[PDB]
Design a protein around this motif. Structure first.
Motif, PDB file in Angstrom:
ATOM      1  N   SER A 204      46.236  60.216  16.471  1.00 53.70           N
ATOM      2  CA  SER A 204      47.226  60.445  15.409  1.00 53.70           C
ATOM      3  C   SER A 204      46.473  60.849  14.163  1.00 53.70           C
ATOM      4  CB  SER A 204      48.031  59.151  15.111  1.00 53.70           C
ATOM      5  OG  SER A 204      48.897  59.335  13.967  1.00 53.70           O
ATOM      6  N   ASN A 205      47.113  61.620  13.318  1.00 53.43           N
ATOM      7  CA  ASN A 205      46.624  61.731  11.950  1.00 53.43           C
ATOM      8  C   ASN A 205      46.871  60.408  11.194  1.00 53.43           C
ATOM      9  OD1 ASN A 205      49.117  62.317   9.881  1.00 53.43           O
ATOM     10  ND2 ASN A 205      49.591  63.001  11.951  1.00 53.43           N
ATOM     11  N   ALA A 206      46.054  60.133  10.178  1.00 51.83           N
ATOM     12  CA  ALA A 206      46.122  58.859   9.457  1.00 51.83           C
ATOM     13  C   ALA A 206      47.377  58.668   8.612  1.00 51.83           C
ATOM     14  CB  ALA A 206      44.876  58.647   8.605  1.00 51.83           C
ATOM     15  N   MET A 207      47.908  59.756   8.052  1.00 52.52           N
ATOM     16  CA  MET A 207      49.083  59.687   7.179  1.00 52.52           C
ATOM     17  C   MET A 207      50.337  59.230   7.913  1.00 52.52           C
ATOM     18  SD  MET A 207      47.831  60.769   4.144  1.00 52.52           S
ATOM     19  CE  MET A 207      48.795  62.078   3.203  1.00 52.52           C
ATOM     20  N   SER A 208      50.588  59.793   9.105  1.00 47.57           N
ATOM     21  CA  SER A 208      51.675  59.355   9.968  1.00 47.57           C
ATOM     22  C   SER A 208      51.428  57.952  10.498  1.00 47.57           C
ATOM     23  CB  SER A 208      51.812  60.283  11.189  1.00 47.57           C
ATOM     24  OG  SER A 208      52.276  61.541  10.761  1.00 47.57           O
TER      25      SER A 208
ATOM     26  N   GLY B  26      43.797  65.264  -0.728  1.00 51.65           N
ATOM     27  CA  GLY B  26      44.941  65.265   0.188  1.00 51.65           C
ATOM     28  C   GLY B  26      44.966  64.100   1.154  1.00 51.65           C
ATOM     29  N   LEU B  27      43.814  63.454   1.370  1.00 49.16           N
ATOM     30  CA  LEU B  27      43.698  62.335   2.311  1.00 49.16           C
ATOM     31  C   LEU B  27      43.179  61.055   1.660  1.00 49.16           C
ATOM     32  CD1 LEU B  27      42.051  64.038   5.450  1.00 49.16           C
ATOM     33  CD2 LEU B  27      44.513  63.703   5.138  1.00 49.16           C
ATOM     34  N   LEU B  28      42.147  61.138   0.836  1.00 49.37           N
ATOM     35  CA  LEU B  28      41.444  59.911   0.453  1.00 49.37           C
ATOM     36  C   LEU B  28      42.329  58.898  -0.294  1.00 49.37           C
ATOM     37  CD1 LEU B  28      38.691  58.403   0.606  1.00 49.37           C
ATOM     38  CD2 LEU B  28      38.152  59.369  -1.599  1.00 49.37           C
TER      39      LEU B  28
END
Ligand SMILES: [Cl-]
Length: 177
Positions: A93-97, A118-120
């Motif tokens: 999975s991507n981390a955001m989901s 966008g991620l950190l």
């Protein structure tokens, strides 16, 4: 691709990481040495599994390893099977989901995203807001110096820091509040 486990029960064991450092891991796991045994660990962008695998070697109780790349998640699963490491799971999975749900508390979290912006900070807020952190959790954050200090919640304090090259390696300690 080869990954070497530098410490713990699989110290010196070599593992394949398909077609797609020691001093870093050495520093981090020296910082984590007195809390790593029986820790519950979450790796948000597990990639090669270098971090999660080193954690399991050093007798982490368990590790949930999150990885967006299907091919990479699959090899990770294979490497866990080689090591006979049953006390781990891999979620493709991507981390955001993944983190945008009711979580489960972890003692140690690794946040080394493939890119920062966008991620950190997003990952950091999801960890804090969705119950992913135990009362006094340690969160490892890797980031380019040029980026400055990341925005962290008020109950997170900078616990350890090393700057080497263009990169800042940090460990935050979280107070349940
Ligand atoms: Cl993500």
């Amino acid at each position: 691709g080869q990954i070497r486990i530098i410490g713990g029960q699989w110290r010196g064991r070599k593992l394949p990481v398909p077609d797609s450092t020691d001093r870093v891991r050495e520093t981090l796991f020296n910082w984590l040495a007195p809390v790593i045994v029986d820790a519950q660990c979450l790796d948000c962008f597990a990639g090669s599994g270098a971090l999660g695998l080193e954690a399991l070697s050093r007798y982490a109780a368990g590790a949930t390893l999150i990885e967006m790349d299907r091919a990479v998640s699959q090899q990770l699963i294979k490497n866990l099977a080689t090591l006979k490491a049953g006390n781990a799971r891999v979620v493709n999975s991507n981390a955001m989901s993944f983190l945008a749900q009711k979580g489960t508390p972890h003692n140690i979290v690794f946040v080394d995203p493939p890119f920062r912006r966008g991620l950190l900070e997003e990952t950091i807020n999801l960890l804090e807001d969705n119950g992913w952190l135990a009362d006094e959790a340690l969160i490892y954050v890797e980031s380019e110096v040029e980026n400055g200090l990341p925005t962290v919640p008020a109950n997170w304090s900078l616990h350890r820091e090393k700057v080497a090259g263009q990169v800042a390696y940090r460990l935050y300690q979280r107070e349940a509040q």
